[PDB]
């Protein structure tokens, strides 16, 4: 799904394959993905 | 295909459905599409 969808103190790495500048998107928000913010992993808690 | 693929004096309209700012991409180039530059029509010549 083009919509990435984050719990509150969660964050995911977006693979900007225009630059592969993988950057943490500190949540939470309804971040929207073009294929320039490609998500890598899951909403796993990361205690 | 995520790769749009243009002949020389050709151009296509990219539907940025983050904004639907449909803009002509005057060719030619190996333009790459996230779903923020959605192609609309074909490489038809447009004399």
Curated annotation (Swiss-Prot), chains A, B:
Question: Superkingdom, according to UniProt?
Answer: Eukaryota
Q: What kind of modification does the protein receive after translation?
A: Phosphorylated on Tyr residues after EGF stimulation. Dephosphorylated by PTPN11.
Give its localization.
Answer: Cytoplasm; Nucleus
Outline the MVP repeats, range by range.
1-47
Q: Which residues form a coiled coil?
A: none
Record text on subunit structure and interactions: The vault ribonucleoprotein particle is a huge (400 A x 670 A) cage structure of 12.9 MDa. It consists of a dimer of half-vaults, with each half-vault comprising 39 identical major vault protein (MVP) chains, PARP4 and one or more vault RNAs (vRNAs). Interacts with TEP1. Interacts with PTEN and activated MAPK1. The phosphorylated protein interacts with the SH2 domains of PTPN11 and SRC. Interacts with APEX1. May interact with ZNF540.
Domain remark in the UniProt entry: MVP 3 mediates interaction with PTEN. MVP 4 mediates interaction with PARP4.
Its job? Required for normal vault structure. Vaults are multi-subunit structures that may act as scaffolds for proteins involved in signal transduction. Vaults may also play a role in nucleo-cytoplasmic transport. Down-regulates IFNG-mediated STAT1 signaling and subsequent activation of JAK. Down-regulates SRC activity and signaling through MAP kinases.
Instruction: Supply the name of the protein.
Output: Major vault protein
Question: Entire protein: which part is shown?
Answer: 5 to 51 of 861
């Amino acid at each position: 799904e083009a919509i990435i969808r984050i719990p509150p103190y969660h964050y995911i790495h977006v693979l900007d394959q225009n630059s592969n500048v993988s950057r943490v998107e500190v949540g939470p928000k309804t971040y929207i993905r073009q294929d320039n913010e490609r998500v890598l992993f899951a909403p796993v808690r990361m205690v």
